Each structure stands twice: as C-alpha cells, then as structure tokens.
Amino acid sequence: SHHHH
Amino acid sequence: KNYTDYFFDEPAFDLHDGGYVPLEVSDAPEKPLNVPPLLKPDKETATDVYYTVTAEAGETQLLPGAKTKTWGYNTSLLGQTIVYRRGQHTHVTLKNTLPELTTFHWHGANVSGPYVDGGCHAPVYPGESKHIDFTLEQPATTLWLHAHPCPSTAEQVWHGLAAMVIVKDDHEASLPLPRNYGVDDIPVILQDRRFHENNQWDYRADYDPDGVAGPTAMINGTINPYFDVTTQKVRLRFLNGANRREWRLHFADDLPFTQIGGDGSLLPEPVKFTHLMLTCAERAEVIVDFGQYHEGDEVTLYTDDVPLLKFRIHAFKPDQTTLPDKLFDVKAPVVDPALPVRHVVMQGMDEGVAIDGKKFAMQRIDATQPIGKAQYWDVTNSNDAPGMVHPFHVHGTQFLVLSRNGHAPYPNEHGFKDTIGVNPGETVRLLVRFDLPGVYMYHCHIIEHEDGGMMAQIETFDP
Amino acid sequence: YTDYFFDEPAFDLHDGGYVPLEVSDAPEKPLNVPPLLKPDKETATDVYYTVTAEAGETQLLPGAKTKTWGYNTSLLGQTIVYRRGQHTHVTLKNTLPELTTFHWHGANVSGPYVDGGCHAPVYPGESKHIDFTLEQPATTLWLHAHPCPSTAEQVWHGLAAMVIVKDDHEASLPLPRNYGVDDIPVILQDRRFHENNQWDYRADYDPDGVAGPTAMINGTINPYFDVTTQKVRLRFLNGANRREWRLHFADDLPFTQIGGDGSLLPEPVKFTHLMLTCAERAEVIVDFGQYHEGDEVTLYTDDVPLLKFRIHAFKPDQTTLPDKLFDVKAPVVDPALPVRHVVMQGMDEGVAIDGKKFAMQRIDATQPIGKAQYWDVTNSNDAPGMVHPFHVHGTQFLVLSRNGHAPYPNEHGFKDTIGVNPGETVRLLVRFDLPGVYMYHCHIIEHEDGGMMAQIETFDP
Ligand SMILES: [Cu+2]
Ligand SMILES: [Cu+2]
Ligand SMILES: [Cu+2]
Ligand SMILES: [Cu+2]
Ligand SMILES: [Cu+2]
Ligand SMILES: [Cu+2]
Ligand SMILES: [Cu+2]
Ligand SMILES: [Cu+2]
C-alpha cells in the first residue's frame, strides 16, 4: 500500500 | 503521518537537487548477488597474517552483451573481502598492475599516516610493490579499502576500486550474531553507475562537480541481485560506496531490522529500524529476521521507491536466539581541558567547495593535534538556502558523536564512527582522539567534493 | 648538415611499439595560425594578461567536432608575447572541469608557484595571480599544463600555447618578424582519432610514450601555408607526447637555424635535415628565393608530408644574416661545487631518475642560487634504447660536451631541454637565478607521469 517520498 | 521516517533533514535530501539523477530499474535478468570471496592469506599464524592486495584491470559481465571494463582488487571488479584481527600483526604487499598510479586507503583503520593510511601522500606507481605493517587496536567493525589519489579518488572508485574489510575481535565473537560469511552474513556494498554504449562506464562523460550519480543501482557489482536465504536471521553489512547518492533503505512491507554496528564499532545497544538512511562511506550492520515468511516468498529491499535487492526465502531452522540489551561498552575518553574547541567549517557546493575558507593543498598542513589527547571538534555545514548533507570523514581516528545542534545524536550514532552526515546549517560536536602520529586527511566524502578540494590535513605529533 | 645529429639506432622508429605517421584523407586547408593574445592593459613597464584554460569543440575533421581543451580558445592557445624587463602580471583562470597547472616551459621564474609546476594547482572555477619580470634573452618558450599526474592527458586534450619573448637585441636583427605572415608557429604534434572524431588518451595509453598516426600542426590536419615573402621564419615546437620529428623539405631545400630553446644561436647554422625531441624548439629561416608563383614545397618528417608551402609572388629580399647573432656569456663554474650526476634509467613502467620514481614531497637535490654547476646527465639504458629529452625547470643551461665531444652544431646557445642518446653522458652548465623548487625530468610526457622525474631546491647562501 505504501510508496516512498 | 507526513514525517520522513529517516533521521536526516528531508529538505536537504539528495533528491531535492537540481541535477538529481533518479534510479531506474534495469531490464537485466535477475541473478545471484555476487558475494566477494574472502581473500586467502599468503600465510597466517596467531600473531602474524600476510596478504597480497593487487589493484588490477579487467572485464566484468554486468549487463547482457559486452563485458564492462572495470578495476578491482585481486578480482576484476571491487575486491575480495579482507579479514583483519585486533592485536594480530598484519603484513600487506600492495601491488599495482593498473596502467595508472593509485593509492591503498584503509578507510576507518587506526594506522600511521601518511604511508600506511594510504592517503594522498602514498602513491603506488604502475608495476610497483609497497610493503606495509600494522597492528589494529580498535574494536570489531566493517571497514573498507578504496583508492585515494588526490585527485582523482572519484574516477578510481568509479572504475571499481573498493573492497570490504572485516575487523574481528574476541568480544564480537562472543555475541549471538549471524557470522557465516556468504550464507547468513553478507556485504551489501551499495553503488550506482551509468552504463553507456557497449555497457561501458565513462566517468568524465558523467562528471558533475556536485557529485556523480548514475541511474543503475549496483550491489556488490551485481545488477538486479537476489540472495537465497537459508536461515531465519541474516546479517547485512551495508556500505555506502557511492560517489554521492544517499540510500534510504527499507523493505517493501516495512519489515523491521536491527542495527548492531556502525562505522567503527558495534552499537552500545541494538536499535530497531523500519527505514534507514546512509550517506557516503557510512556503514551500518543490521540483522533481519525472516521468521514471518515461507519457502517461495521473495522479499525486496528498496531505496525510496526503487527495488534494490531481493531475498528469496527457503526452508530454515527456527532461530529462537535473542540479542542482549547491551552489545558493547563504549568507553569515552575525557576531554583534555587544556585543548580548545576546534572549529571545522564545510562551505560551498559545486565548484566553490572548501574547508575553513580554502581548497586542499597537497603541501599545506591545516591543523595540528597531540596524539593520545582527545579534543572536541565542532563541524559545521554552513550552506543552507537550499543545502545538502555532507558526510564528514577523518583519517586515523574513530570518533564519538556528542551532539547535533546542541541536541542528542541520532539513535544509531552512540558508537564509534569515522563518517558523519552534517545537515545544512548544522554543527555537530565530535570527540576526536588520534592514537598514532602521522598526516591525516579530513574531508567531505561526497567524492567529487573531495577531488574538488573540500579537504584539509592534520599533522599529529608526540608532545 | 645533411643527416640527423642523434644516434640512428636509437630513433623512435626502432621501438617495438612504434606508430608510423599516415597521411590523413581529410581535406587540405589553411594552416591555423594562433592569434596573438591581446593584453588587458599595457604600458611600457607593465603588461596585464588573462589566460583561461577552457574546454570546447574544434572542427578538425568533417562531421563531429573534436572535444578539445585550450587557453583562450578551444584547442592549443593564443600566442603570448612577453618582453625582457617588462613587469608581467597574469591572471590564471581555470574553466576546465578538472584541476590544472600553468607551466611556463623555459621561463626563468620563481618556483614552485610561478613556475606553475606540480605544486601550483588551480581548481575548476578558481582564479590565480602571478607576477614576474623576465630577465633572459629573446626566444620561443611555451605554456602547457603540468599536474603530476597527468601532464600527458592534459597536453593531449590540447593545453599547449606558444610564448614569444622579445628583447632589444633580437629586434635589431634582420629577421622575418611579421607574426602570421612571414613568421609562424609550427607546433608539431600527433593524435589518434576515434569514433566521432574524438580523442581517447587512456585508450591509446602506452607507458613508454603515446603517439597517434595523424600529424597535427597548430591544431590543423593536412595544412598548407601561403608564402607571400621570400624569407620565412618557422618557430618549430615539438609538442608531441613522444614522437621525434625529422624535418626536411623536398629538393633538400636548405634552411638556417637562428634560435634554440633559450636564446638565439651564437651563430647561424645551415641545415638540410633537422631532428627535434620532445619540448625542443628550433627557429629557422627558409629562403624561397629560387621558386616562382604557383610552385609548391612540402615539409616532411621522415617520408611523411606535413606542411605544404604554396609560393605566391614576393618582393625580393636577400638581406643576409650576420656571422654572429648573439653573444653567449658563459658563467664561470663555481669550483667550490662538485660535479652533479643525474642518471636517467629504465623504460616503460621501470622509468626512474637516480634509483627512484618521483615523489611530490621529497626533495631530491639542492643547489645555491647565482652559482653555476656542472650537471653530468647520463642515459643509462643499454642495448636498443631511446633518446630521452632531459629538461630542467627554472633555468636555461649551456651544453658543454657529449661523451667528451663537442655538442651538436645547434647546441651552443641557451637550452632547457636536451636529448640524451642511449649510453651517453652530456655535460651541462646549470645556474638558477631564483629560489624555489624546480623539477627535472624526461620530457617524454608518459615517462614524466611514469615517475621519471625528481625535484631540486634552490636557496640563497
Ligand atoms: Cu573513504
Ligand atoms: Cu578515509
Ligand atoms: Cu560535500
Ligand atoms: Cu580520505
Ligand atoms: Cu614542458
Ligand atoms: Cu618545464
Ligand atoms: Cu624518458
Ligand atoms: Cu616539467
């Protein structure tokens, strides 16, 4: 579910 | 929610840079992570070890088609891992079979300068052999060997001259830590490159005075690596061997992992992480527990939103072992009260980089400090408006981090370090003691900044 | 003087790795004559110059422009005029993406900053100032890069420029002196071209000397020169990394040498064939008197054509050269001082001077300023061997003997570079006017970078 920046 | 996870200042991250190069996933087929073999001693006893380290040129299959022209130590790219032991007299023949002169720097190793240290003043010409002798009196840790001509350190590292150095001792050996090199304890040397036509590198074509960075991640000289896990717990020795890029490490699903070591030593106490940021030259040793996973599972380490390294999970024995609350006793020197506070100011970016108002001069001594006596260093990164994180490094010492802008160090900075990222506008207070006499460099370890002259030298003496 | 002075067995063309010159298929075109660098300011007692190392592009062949470096232009450099006794102020500016150095080859200037050798870095974007007053005879010097390493890589990129030094004596002599018309640089170099007309020093690297097959004259391929006068002055500079030039015309047209590295020759010397090793200079006069409009005379090295001279109509001019050009005042050697021995040794990777490779922070020798000493310089290497052009910073020396015999006919003037044949000991008379740290080395540039280089400190007693 989670993407970074 | 809407915080950055990592300890450094989010506005200063490398990815806010004008000339920032994002990583791109390569098409290259996935393949086993190259684990550099352990360099076999020439001979060994309990008191003496003998090694031959050979800078050489060659070719390395990295991408499909033509092999990449590369440099390495006792291998075509990077280097065989070199094991040193505290208290063991260590003897090294340095041999240069490159067509250019080089230098053998043991980053983080407390050895005499300037010859043993292998900095700017220790040339080894093509075809020449040098002999060095030393006995390490420092705790177990992960160091590394890289080239260090002044200039160009950046070119030669880019060519491929970097190698992991593992320092052993009795204390670390007594800890319940994964230690089967290549099976449950591995180097993870993090680098990037740009591949041109015929899969070749070209440093000068890619040159940028503010740091060189290519789109292709390279781990132990492997593109799109996977590692086959056969144990529950795995130790990863992260080394940032990139010219400039910062790594923001985390698993796809935020699998926790515990840091047990830094540049110069084990941490005093294990520190639990979800997200870990490394600047250039920093090492961080972590334990990952794959207990939640099952045969067939493939778990990926990312940097930001880019996949780096895959962990293929196979059957593994239950591991019930548990880390102690304290790993290592950190014995801080007392500050010699006779000595003042040394102030080191890192300034500029791009072409204007400097330390304390000047660019490095080979022949110029910038500083003196007595051996055996410990001094506070206040290291400031003066540029702010939009700024960048400068990894400050000193030769011939493992220092301690006392404070950041008058506040606590980051949670993973309570052991011995040799490289610290300094945020824009920030002053960090380090506790620096040199054991041996010599001439030692101190500089920013963004390697283009190094070569651009953001570097000074200190002469240590016996009083 | 019909054949070359140096030992034939030792010529570059006997090396195992020899690269012959080949005539390029590129179009013939006018010889580039570098413009004179215009001063920023000038009076009679002061001159002010800005010299900028820059990176650019040059049409050398059809298609893509070659990536080059130069001073105040994309390749080579604008010629720089200095005057004996004039206080010279130079801003040294570096717009390269790499650090460099500004070495004035043959200039009697203080070391090691002004000399601009190994110890005078200038980083990208940085400026430096230098001040000097030349107190030496008129001659042709040159400027080139001198980071240690790599001088070879930077020269290869194109950092070299002719420096002309004026004095009253030379002004009063009857010599062609109209820059770009009857008095021209002949900067002799070679290069190897790769895909897209690019250079790649490191691909072409050889530790014994780098040489490509295509000759390059003042950064021109296949040049011709339009002669509009009977007499022409050529200022020959060997700016090759390694190649020797063996110079002669068709019809064995004679030419007369008036100048060497450091000064006018004491007397003019008539030539049919002339050899130059790395960094040597030779100013010659060519007389085209016996040729008519539309005639064509070619300058060759060995069997290879280099430069076509096209003869147009010229006013007659037969005003000949005096028997004596220049008065050479040899200093008395100091009898206090001993004979210094310098031994150049090895080839390829084993090149060395007096047993050791160059070290930046080691001083290898000392000598008092104002005091002259015999330097015996030996080329020790046996069997086949090479001619090593030995060069000393901070001085113009005199040549006394070669293996106990007379120097070559063109070596009675001041020189800063001398070719030492295999097995040969040459005796030099060396004096330093100024204190500093000056290097001495072979001027085969790969050998310099390969460590065949030492350094001497001069001090006031
Ligand atoms: Cu380092
Ligand atoms: Cu270091
Ligand atoms: Cu920096
Ligand atoms: Cu360093
Ligand atoms: Cu020179
Ligand atoms: Cu010189
Ligand atoms: Cu030589
Ligand atoms: Cu020189």
XYZ file of all heavy atoms in Angstrom, chain B residues 101 120 148-156 204 360 362 450-452, chain C residues 98-99 121 123 147-150:
193
model
N 48.810 5.307 -11.652
C 49.191 5.224 -10.255
C 47.923 5.280 -9.405
O 46.910 5.822 -9.834
C 50.250 6.255 -9.855
C 49.808 7.672 -9.481
C 49.098 7.804 -8.144
C 51.070 8.517 -9.467
N 46.556 10.649 0.156
C 47.124 11.376 -0.968
C 48.639 11.177 -1.098
O 49.160 11.187 -2.212
C 46.864 12.871 -0.833
S 45.127 13.303 -0.542
N 42.775 6.274 -3.308
C 42.758 7.610 -2.729
C 43.862 8.525 -3.280
O 44.486 9.249 -2.504
C 42.805 7.479 -1.201
C 42.300 8.648 -0.448
N 42.929 9.867 -0.488
C 41.243 8.796 0.355
C 42.257 10.718 0.273
N 41.239 10.085 0.806
N 44.095 8.598 -4.616
C 44.937 9.647 -5.201
C 44.180 10.967 -5.193
O 42.952 10.969 -5.244
C 45.212 9.157 -6.629
C 43.967 8.371 -6.961
C 43.562 7.695 -5.649
N 44.920 12.081 -5.158
C 44.300 13.364 -4.872
C 44.715 14.415 -5.902
O 45.601 15.224 -5.626
C 44.639 13.809 -3.457
S 44.120 12.634 -2.173
N 44.067 14.491 -7.093
C 42.957 13.611 -7.483
C 43.441 12.378 -8.254
O 44.647 12.170 -8.346
C 42.112 14.597 -8.336
C 43.131 15.492 -9.024
C 44.378 15.476 -8.141
N 42.537 11.526 -8.775
C 41.096 11.582 -8.564
C 40.634 10.304 -7.871
O 40.635 9.233 -8.473
C 40.350 11.770 -9.862
O 38.944 11.804 -9.650
N 40.227 10.443 -6.605
C 39.610 9.356 -5.864
C 38.303 8.928 -6.548
O 38.010 7.731 -6.631
C 39.420 9.815 -4.415
O 40.732 9.908 -3.873
C 38.673 8.822 -3.543
N 37.534 9.894 -7.072
C 36.235 9.605 -7.663
C 36.360 8.702 -8.892
O 35.621 7.727 -9.019
C 35.529 10.887 -8.010
N 37.284 9.036 -9.800
C 37.489 8.249 -11.010
C 37.796 6.804 -10.644
O 37.237 5.888 -11.224
C 38.669 8.699 -11.878
C 38.274 9.181 -13.265
C 39.425 9.478 -14.211
O 40.357 10.191 -13.784
O 39.373 9.037 -15.381
N 38.716 6.625 -9.693
C 39.281 5.316 -9.430
C 38.262 4.438 -8.708
O 38.226 3.237 -8.941
C 40.615 5.477 -8.706
C 41.709 6.058 -9.595
C 43.104 5.682 -9.151
O 43.320 5.147 -8.057
N 44.075 5.963 -10.004
N 34.239 10.746 -16.921
C 34.377 12.130 -17.356
C 33.157 12.585 -18.165
O 32.749 13.747 -18.093
C 35.707 12.300 -18.104
C 36.936 12.149 -17.212
C 37.009 13.216 -16.115
N 37.872 12.833 -14.989
C 37.968 13.495 -13.828
N 37.211 14.554 -13.584
N 38.833 13.102 -12.907
N 41.989 22.312 -0.746
C 43.104 21.487 -0.331
C 44.369 21.861 -1.100
O 44.331 22.108 -2.305
C 42.653 20.046 -0.560
C 43.725 19.026 -0.232
C 44.186 18.872 1.071
C 44.257 18.223 -1.229
C 45.163 17.934 1.369
C 45.223 17.282 -0.924
C 45.677 17.138 0.372
N 48.182 19.985 -1.333
C 48.951 18.793 -1.012
C 50.014 19.086 0.046
O 50.245 18.286 0.947
C 49.654 18.273 -2.271
C 50.266 16.892 -2.131
S 49.240 15.553 -2.771
C 47.664 15.992 -2.042
N 35.507 15.912 -2.488
C 36.871 15.564 -2.123
C 37.842 16.087 -3.185
O 38.714 16.903 -2.894
C 36.946 14.042 -2.002
C 37.969 13.533 -0.997
C 38.006 12.015 -0.989
O 36.955 11.388 -0.695
O 39.092 11.465 -1.295
N 37.647 15.630 -4.428
C 38.530 15.931 -5.542
C 38.442 17.415 -5.900
O 39.410 17.986 -6.391
C 38.202 15.060 -6.747
C 38.538 13.574 -6.646
O 39.498 13.224 -5.917
O 37.834 12.772 -7.305
N 37.273 18.029 -5.672
C 37.078 19.458 -5.878
C 37.749 20.310 -4.796
O 37.642 21.532 -4.816
N 38.364 19.979 -14.625
C 39.403 19.321 -13.839
C 40.448 20.339 -13.391
O 40.562 21.416 -13.974
C 40.123 18.230 -14.626
C 39.234 17.030 -14.936
C 39.892 16.037 -15.876
O 40.989 15.569 -15.503
O 39.333 15.747 -16.963
N 41.215 19.985 -12.353
C 42.264 20.872 -11.891
C 43.414 20.798 -12.892
O 43.604 19.780 -13.542
C 42.677 20.607 -10.441
C 43.824 19.638 -10.151
C 45.216 20.197 -10.418
C 43.720 19.240 -8.683
N 48.523 23.870 -8.217
C 47.182 23.578 -8.722
C 46.283 24.810 -8.806
O 46.413 25.734 -8.008
C 46.655 22.556 -7.705
C 47.400 22.879 -6.437
C 48.798 23.198 -6.936
N 42.081 24.959 -9.202
C 40.897 24.115 -9.257
C 39.895 24.709 -10.243
O 39.952 25.901 -10.546
C 40.224 23.956 -7.890
C 40.978 23.078 -6.902
C 41.985 23.604 -6.100
C 40.674 21.726 -6.762
C 42.678 22.810 -5.202
C 41.359 20.923 -5.863
C 42.363 21.469 -5.085
O 43.049 20.703 -4.196
N 50.003 19.186 -14.131
C 49.593 18.442 -12.942
C 50.381 17.140 -12.960
O 50.764 16.661 -14.027
C 48.104 18.232 -13.132
C 47.948 18.155 -14.631
C 48.967 19.145 -15.177
N 50.609 16.577 -11.775
C 51.564 15.497 -11.622
C 50.932 14.352 -10.835
O 51.089 14.301 -9.620
C 52.827 16.026 -10.945
S 53.674 17.319 -11.898
N 50.200 13.394 -11.454
C 49.855 13.405 -12.882
C 48.558 14.159 -13.162
O 47.956 14.676 -12.225
C 49.736 11.894 -13.165
C 49.194 11.295 -11.888
C 49.675 12.206 -10.766
N 48.109 14.244 -14.429
C 48.783 13.733 -15.615
C 49.026 14.859 -16.613
O 48.087 15.338 -17.244
C 47.977 12.654 -16.282
O 48.465 12.380 -17.588
